[PDB]
């Protein structure tokens, strides 16, 4: 009466007759307030945890409908012609939102635009109602000219809009562009007029928050996430344990210690960390010996996280892939056809891993400088979150032994630099 | 050079020469605002996740220092004598806070009192600084007379203060008592004056929040928790899967299906659920067959949570306790001496379980009516959270087969009612 699904190992009822609530996230705020930053980052998180999510950026539509950008005159409230085009762009983007949530299997749509007037948000609110969408608002408020100017410098002057421009011209144009929105801007007011909307106001670059009427599970998760990200500059280092005894034999999982090359890698990592010369580096390890041994070489304090333990291979723990193929050929084959979803028997899938890692991801967002010493599958999962890689790609990312990945959060994403530390090891990578 | 600790199985450096930042949570708000409710509940959560936490209730000190309560005249601002006693009570409680955090190994102290003036909070702030304590503020704001009156009815009229009183007298006294605080009350203002304090304002019974300057990991976890609890009436039902084939043989873990008695229990549970006649019951199961089979009998929609899977016995999975004793006598003995902390090899401890369950607990707080069909160890862990049971007691709670535990959140805690559904089963309970 119940059968176990062969790939994911879930118990489902046998079916002998197999022959016969989405959300719009609305961005709100003046330009250079980090709205797109938040859009892209939240969407990265949501897709990584498995909630299919898509950004609809009104400006990207405008750049599609109007070939070259001239200047802020385009944004003047008295520009009858431009205003028509901009309104049509928003409506076109909202039509794609509808198509995405109602028809293409998407669960969250992030509507990335200014949305600074009650008029406009009323229209968006009526749109979600008509279509049976929940609406959630994220307003970014920034009253600090230093931050605004830094923002413009960081992401505005080098965007496509300002391709034939120097700094002072682009900066100057952009301040005036901001000006066009200032006059009619009506902040979200949950005290009085917006009493009923589900929203979060992000204040002082994420140090203060107003949150109103969280409706549901996903909204609550979004709020948690948003409240713990920050934009302090930092560096994230990810690597595997130094080579271990099981690596040498091509055995998966288990709890083996460093091979002598692994020990050499640990020393090398110590030297490397020492010369990065970092303020307040947090070091994290799994609870498996190989990662702990590697962290010991650093003579720094480290924390062990059960949640960083390598993927669990269930009955296949401590086997070679060959022993897996000979002993469990049907399991071996299943995994090859669906590597992200496949669960080892009594063990885990990459999908399970992602879920075990949520607390790690959330704490990494809270930290600054961190070094995570972990494992192949685990490292693939973390890297996929940072680099916005898909579930289908995640189990084939290349994370080789003895190599540090240096991640530098930049605006809208992540710079990855690879640094091999010159100690030989086996290769555990396996192509599709 | 590294050795594996025998109980918890953690790798630590061998030590050949073994011969040689706490927080005050400050409650803020008028009486009957739910401050003690929040104190007791947050402290329940924090202790359950392993952060040692203690409530210091100024009123409990006052009732200790002044035998019988007379009336609200005691709380008059012009009562020179009472005010001296009350001030001395706060200071005595703050002295115990200091003793607890600095000397008795406690990590969070919840200072449960009104703390409604800037004067008073300045004094508390200076106290934490002097002692190297972080200070975090929770203010409960309630502007809805209906809620206030309901609160007084619910917890005030039947407290020790009002032992020789009828409702209308106690209610009447209490409104006047509230009055004494109203005049000098200065809410937290993070806009202007409290710009620098770490705080959360809870507004509209937990539907709106102001959050300012979260400093650290634990503060961020407290905020998450506070923002997802609610006081809507609800019922929580917890039970195990119907008896399974492994139960009959005294085997632990594995993924066996219902014995025929288990099937009878499932039907019985269906009948039971049907006659509780509940609005919108959510049903949760583990991903193990026995719980899924039981939920099938209900003909209701259910959700499977990997996180509800029974504790993992590692190498001992699918063994009898006797086979454990004969095959792993040193492991068997270790577990008996330290059942909460002991980790099975390649497996889990109850401590691991608690951590896997955090997302379940958080989602249970968000829900209303829920039925959780799970497993012995898992059920002990959830029950310990709800009933404020210690880590040392948690692995010996009695959660027998075929028996529903009906939990009714009441103010300050949880009513547990047991309901046996009259189907025989083995007993899997094991005394210390
Ligand atoms: O082209 C862009 O870069 C762009 C960026 C944001 C943006 N914001 S919007 O909310 O979608 C929008 C669309 C059309 C008009 C307006 C608008 C703009 C104002 F300045 C004042 C009132 C308004 O209603 C705003 C519109 C745009 O065209
Ligand atoms: O006895 C009680 O039930 C009680 C309950 C709360 C409480 N709040 S308290 O912040 O600790 C406190 C202690 C001493 C004086 C005051 C106080 C009370 C006021 F009405 C006005 C100004 C103040 O400074 C408040 C004091 C109490 O005595
Ligand atoms: N809460 C915030 N307040 C102010 N600036 C922020 C915030 N979060 C991110 N930023 C900054 O915003 C910049 C990105 O700007 P962008 O997202 O293009 O703004 P907008 O979409 O509002 O025009 C980055 O420099 C980033 O550091
Ligand atoms: N955010 C809140 N606002 C108002 N009332 C609440 C809130 N949370 C809990 N309550 C209610 O508060 C009551 C408990 O009162 P209590 O904690 O004794 O108040 P106080 O300690 O402020 O005198 C319960 O009835 C509970 O439902
Ligand atoms: O998903 P894949 O490609 O099998 O790689 C994960 C494997 O890598 C290892 O970390 C090291 O070989 C194993 O412990 C684990 O089973
Ligand atoms: O901690 P204890 O008392 O061994 O009980 C937990 C055991 O109970 C069971 O749920 C049922 O016997 C086992 O699967 C599990 O090992």
Numbering used by the authors:
A (entry chain A), B (entry chain A): 3 to 22, 33 to 444
Authors' own words:
These bifunctional enzymes synthesize and degrade fructose-2,6-bisphosphate (F-2,6-P2), which acts as an allosteric activator for the rate-limiting enzyme and committed step in glycolysis, i.e., 6-phophofructo-1-kinase (PFK-1). In contrast to the PFKFB isoforms 1, 2, and 4, which are constitutively expressed in testes/kidney/heart and liver/muscle, PFKFB3 is an inducible isoform9 with increased expression in response to hypoxia, extracellular acidosis, and inflammation.
Competition experiments with ATP were used to identify ATP-competitive and non-ATP-competitive binders. Significant cross-reactivity is only observed for PFKFB4, although the selectivity window is about 20-fold with IC50 values of 0.19 and 3.6 µM, respectively. The sub-µM potency for PFKFB3 was also confirmed using isothermal titration calorimetry as illustrated in Figure S6D and co-crystal structures demonstrated binding in the active site, mimicking several of the interactions made by the endogenous substrate fructose-6-phosphate (F6P). Further characterization of KAN0438241 and its ester KAN0438757, which was designed to increase cell permeability and efficient intracellular hydrolysis to release the active compound, involved examination of their impact on the proximal biomarker F-2,6-P2 in several different cell lines. Given the binding pose, which involves important interactions for the carboxylate, the lack of activity for the ester in a non-cellular setting is not surprising. Both compounds displayed high selectivity (SScore(35) = 0) at 2 µM.
